[PDB]
DNA sequence: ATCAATATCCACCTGCAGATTCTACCAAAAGTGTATTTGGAAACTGCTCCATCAAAAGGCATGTTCAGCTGAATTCAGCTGAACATGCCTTTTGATGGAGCAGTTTCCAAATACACTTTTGGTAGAATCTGCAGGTGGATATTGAT
DNA sequence: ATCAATATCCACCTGCAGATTCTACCAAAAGTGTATTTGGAAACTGCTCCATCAAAAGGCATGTTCAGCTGAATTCAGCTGAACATGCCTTTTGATGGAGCAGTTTCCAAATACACTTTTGGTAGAATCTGCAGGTGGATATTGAT
């Protein structure tokens, strides 16, 4: 039967998700996490559905942003594989830590 | 007899000056009676919190007079003040001593 | 001309916390920038809050929320206590 | 819940960010980061809600919160 | 006859922008006769510039309506717009880029 | 509830009469216009206060523009602003 | 008067080394000294440009420390110690 | 003839300058550089002496900060020597480039 | 690079439905005109403080030599993460109610603005105090060679 | 392992630049009395928001297998650190003209503040149409194999 090499599909996926703009986290889980975090600050809240969507957009744009700097950090260490140390370096240099 | 607003609120920091500055900034149409009081109290508490730690830094270097170096040591060594002033430069403050472990000679 | 400053108030507060301890003018410069910086961050946030809620008046309540948005956790809590305290004391004449 | 943010979803996010090969430890690291991000935005947003004496977090609450955090978002009221 | 926008030859609403500036400053601050005009003009210009670039982006994809993606393409692809508008464009996506050392 | 859509749409028609704009895209343009306005108004406010003034004049708007826009954008923005005031004060 | 030229080279290799030491750097490749100059000039160009815009707006001919403080604040490099 | 090993004196220097607070760039050369840059933006400017010192404090703090971040990029590539590519990675991630 | 199979893609059309556009009416802006104000611009000018000059000295910058050990290259294998086909269940979707609750009005009590008219705290220098910078010398590491 | 060779403390000492006090006007805080908003409290809407429910649909979890990537190991040319000689130019210390900030006045041009009168942009239902998402059939790219 048939089998693509490791990396082939990866690059395929990069091209596909860099082309499109649809949110990449599933809405219900995300909405569920938002409400959970929110509950620790103020009990019994409602959310405008636009507020949940605004959060998910800001959040996906942030993580996508972060994976870009993360990738630059892995490349800097002559790697093609991102690791937690790469994320930590990017977040450190960004002033988020 | 004239009794100062700072005194009525139990504060060192100038409640009247802070009210005047709140009006001068045209931050809004009106300023409530309690806004300058509350704001004076916050600023005074933050000042106290920083002089407390800077004062302690001075003592550790065996000095009587607080300098910007002590103010820096006090800010950067405190996690919440460091975050509050995380994008501020303290002139003549220097940095915290900090040498990454991989740079130390390998005994 | 007259150039106002927070220096004598900073100096009072210093004596309360460290009666034995002085402060150089350069350090006082920095404490002064600090107090203006924070005043401005708080007044700024308060002003925005008021405008967002169509309110013409900045009250202790706006200052308080601004303090909670601006200060990182433990400093927020204590600043709120001190501010609240000073308002309740002030308003009991 | 935070595990509701799944490996393939995190995988897609990294793909959009141009990442080709992902260490297995990334998925957990990403969820911790994601959690701190939401905690910070949501706290600020709830603070705006509560200031407005409302029980409903609005899009503008979030927008103001993102703006405060220097993550200005366009398309939801500012 | 005649609106302030019209006097100044702008599509953007000088009357409104004055009202907003008046709200920012208070009844204790003041706004000049023309500050509203000038501000209105600046806002219209930058709007035209973004619409011009996003409109090209949508024509180059042979599409009638400007969407968020076209706004992201136009903004991020222009060095001056990119530096001015560091905001997140909802539904914008990213510009396709794959680092050299990752290609087969 | 006020918006800038009407005005954005008029400007769209000048620069691209054939082109339309989707709803979500209009949302971005609205955010854009409110953002730039606050930035400029804010800088202009600070300028006046830095100089112990209480009036935001077109002069503050201009320096604000020079401080906020990156180069070519500022040059052209400044020109459009002066052109608009010039026309306005002629009448 | 007198022509100003090449003063970037006033930022010497030992001054750069010193700055790198305070930043905790132990070893410095040969090309760092010219990168650093480039990076310094850009930073300074940007602060001065803003500082002088504040100065012109106030119809002054003299750049004040406040002009610089306001410029640094503008660019998110807030500076305490100079008013 | 005694001779410290390479790196002993660099470590000593780190400890020395991390302990002090004095400006590390010479003052007159820095002032000429301010005057030169400013003159190319606008002729016949004067400077308050405190404005030149504010600039020098700012630049030095900026540069020390950059070198801290540069140093972490070098360490990340399993180096101890900082290189132009470490600076550029740091400035890219900081959003300066 | 080609011989051949396996899947991705990429065109060019195409038809539907979710969004758009257009079209039809009512209040808060927005514009006109008077009258009243006032913030900041013009006009000296007092007087900081900025530029410039000089001149003597030593702290540092420059340029050199030398080799320690670093960065870069190369090689290898254990093993980590990609690919996949399998088998299932959680998210999506789409009204439907129900209700909680944001968002309006209607009083007016409380609060804030404003306008004078006294009082006093804070400021600008003059006058007094005193921490510590800077210089030196032995005690205590710290380092690097045999 | 010891030691030599330097670096680095650490404490003791003391005049001076710089901090802490002491005075003397005054701007601005505080006290009143009057006029003006404000933005809370109750009594109620019309949404949107939560909560089911209820299909089928996708998308996720799962385990296997192995390509190829990461790190560990080993080499070595030569970059960069340490030390040194030499001497330049920065630093320090004053002094001086005079630019130009800046401190008080002065009166309009430019501002607010009404009382007006029109008109506009927000809104809630009508009147298409862009382009999504499919379905072809054609190369293309990808991977195993003389
Ligand atoms: Cl890691
Ligand atoms: Cl209040
Ligand atoms: Cl004007
Ligand atoms: Cl490099
Ligand atoms: Mn609920
Ligand atoms: Mn020049
Ligand atoms: Mn006046
Ligand atoms: Mn090595
Ligand atoms: Mn193998
Ligand atoms: Mn007194
Ligand atoms: Mn000493
Ligand atoms: Mn399509």
List keywords for this structure.
heterooctamer, C: 93 residues, mainly alpha, Histone, subunit A, D: 78 residues, 3 helices, 3 strands, binds chloride ion, binds manganese (II) ion, DNA-binding, dna binding protein, Histone variant, nucleosome, decameric
Question: Can you describe what's shown?
Answer:
The complex is a heterooctamer, with two copies of chain A (97 residues), one copy of chain B (107 residues), two copies of chain C, two copies of chain D and one copy of chain E (104 residues). Chain B has a single domain (1-107), classed as Histone, subunit A (Orthogonal Bundle), CATH 1.10.20.10. Chain B has five helices and three strands; from the N terminus they run H-H-E-H-E-H-H-E. Chain B has helices spanning 5-9, 15-24, 34-60, 68-77, 79-84; strands at residues 30-31, 65-66, 89-90. The termini of chain B are far apart. Chain C is 73% helix and 4% strand. In chain C, helix 2 (25-52) packs across helix 3 and helix 3 (60-70) runs antiparallel to helix 4 (74-91). With 78 residues, chain D is mainly alpha-helical. Chain D has one domain: Orthogonal Bundle (Histone, subunit A), CATH 1.10.20.10. Helix content of chain D is 59%, strand content 8%. Chain D has three helices and three strands. Chain D is elongated and about 45 Å long. Chain D starts with 6 loop residues before the first helix and ends with a strand. Chain E is mainly α. Chain E has one domain (1-104): Histone, subunit A. In chain E, helix 3 crosses helix 4. The longest helix of chain E is centred in the middle third of the chain and has 25 residues, at 35-59. Chain E starts with a helix and ends in a 15-residue tail after the last strand. At the B-C interface, helix 1, helix 2, strand 1, helix 3 and strand 2 of B face helix 1, strand 1, helix 2, strand 2 and helix 3 of C. Strand 2 (65-66) of chain B pairs parallel with strand 1 of chain C. The complex binds chloride ion (4 copies) and manganese (II) ion (MN) (8 copies). Chain A binds a DNA duplex (146 and 146 nucleotides) through helix 1, helix 2 and strand 1. Chain D: The modification N6-butyryllysine is found at residues 7, 20, 53, 55, 67. Chain D: Belongs to the histone H4 family. Chain D: Keywords: Acetylation, Chromosomal rearrangement, Chromosome, Citrullination, Disease variant, DNA-binding, Hydroxylation, Intellectual disability, Isopeptide bond, Methylation, Nucleosome core, Nucleus, Phosphoprotein, Ubl conjugation. Chain D: The modification N6-lactoyllysine is found at residues 7, 53, 67. Chain D: The modification N6-succinyllysine is found at residues 7, 53, 55, 67.
Find the count of extended strands of chain B (DSSP E, 2+ residues): 3
Name given to the CATH homologous superfamily of chain B = Histone, subunit A
The kinds of small molecule bound in this structure are: chloride ion, manganese (II) ion
SS class of chain B: mainly alpha
Domains of chain C, number: 1
Question: How does the overall form of chain C come out from the CA principal axes?
Answer: globular
What's the CATH C level of chain C? Answer: Mainly Alpha
Biggest chain pair interface: B-C, 61 and 61 residues
Radius of gyration from the alpha-carbon trace of chain B, in angstroms: 19 Å
């Amino acid at each position: 039967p048939h089998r693509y090499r490791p990396g082939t599909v990866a690059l395929r996926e990069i091209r596909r998700y860099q082309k499109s703009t649809e949110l990449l986290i599933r809405k219900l889980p995300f909405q569920r996490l938002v409400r959970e975090i929110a509950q620790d600050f103020k009990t019994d809240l409602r959310f405008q559905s636009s507020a949940v969507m605004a959060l998910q957009e800001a959040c996906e744009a942030y993580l996508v942003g972060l994976f870009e700097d993360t990738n630059l950090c892995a490349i800097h260490a002559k790697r093609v594989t991102i690791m937690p140390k790469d994320i930590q370096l990017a977040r450190r240099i960004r002033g988020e830590r | 007899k004239a009794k100062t607003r700072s005194s009525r609120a139990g504060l060192q920091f100038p409640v009247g000056r802070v009210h005047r500055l709140l009006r001068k900034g045209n931050y809004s149409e009106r300023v409530g009676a309690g806004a300058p009081v509350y704001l004076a109290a916050v600023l005074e508490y933050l000042t106290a919190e920083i002089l407390e730690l800077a004062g302690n830094a001075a003592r550790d270097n065996k000095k009587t007079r607080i300098i910007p170096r002590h103010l820096q040591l006090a800010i950067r060594n405190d996690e919440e003040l460091n975050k509050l002033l995380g994008r501020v430069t303290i002139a003549q403050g220097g940095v915290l001593p900090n040498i990454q472990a991989v740079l130390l000679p390998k005994k | 001309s007259r150039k106002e400053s927070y220096s004598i108030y900073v100096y009072k507060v210093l004596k309360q916390v460290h009666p034995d301890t002085g402060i150089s003018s350069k350090a006082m410069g920095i404490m002064n920038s600090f107090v203006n910086d924070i005043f401005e961050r708080i007044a700024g946030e308060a002003s925005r809050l008021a405008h967002y809620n169509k309110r013409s008046t900045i009250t202790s309540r706006e200052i308080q929320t601004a303090v909670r948005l601006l200060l990182p956790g433990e400093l927020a809590k204590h600043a709120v206590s001190e501010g609240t305290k000073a308002v309740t004391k002030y308003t009991s004449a | 819940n935070i595990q509701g943010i799944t490996k393939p979803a995190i995988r897609r996010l990294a793909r959009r960010g141009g990442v080709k090969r992902i260490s297995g430890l990334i998925y957990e690291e990403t969820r911790g980061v994601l959690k701190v991000f939401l905690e910070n935005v949501i706290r600020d947003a709830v603070t705006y809600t509560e200031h407005a004496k409302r029980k409903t977090v609005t899009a503008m609450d979030v927008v103001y919160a993102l703006k405060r955090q220097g993550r200005t978002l366009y398309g939801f009221g500012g | 006859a005649v609106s302030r926008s019209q006097r100044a030859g702008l599509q953007f609403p000088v009357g409104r922008i004055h009202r907003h500036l008046k709200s920012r400053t208070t009844s204790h601050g003041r706004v000049g006769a023309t500050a509203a005009v000038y501000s209105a003009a600046i806002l219209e210009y930058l709007t035209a510039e973004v619409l011009e670039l996003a409109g090209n982006a949508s024509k180059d994809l042979k599409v009638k309506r400007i969407t968020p993606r076209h706004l992201q393409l136009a903004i991020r692809g222009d060095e001056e717009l990119d530096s001015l508008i560091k905001a997140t464009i909802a539904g914008g996506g990213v510009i396709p880029h794959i680092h050299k050392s990752l290609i087969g």
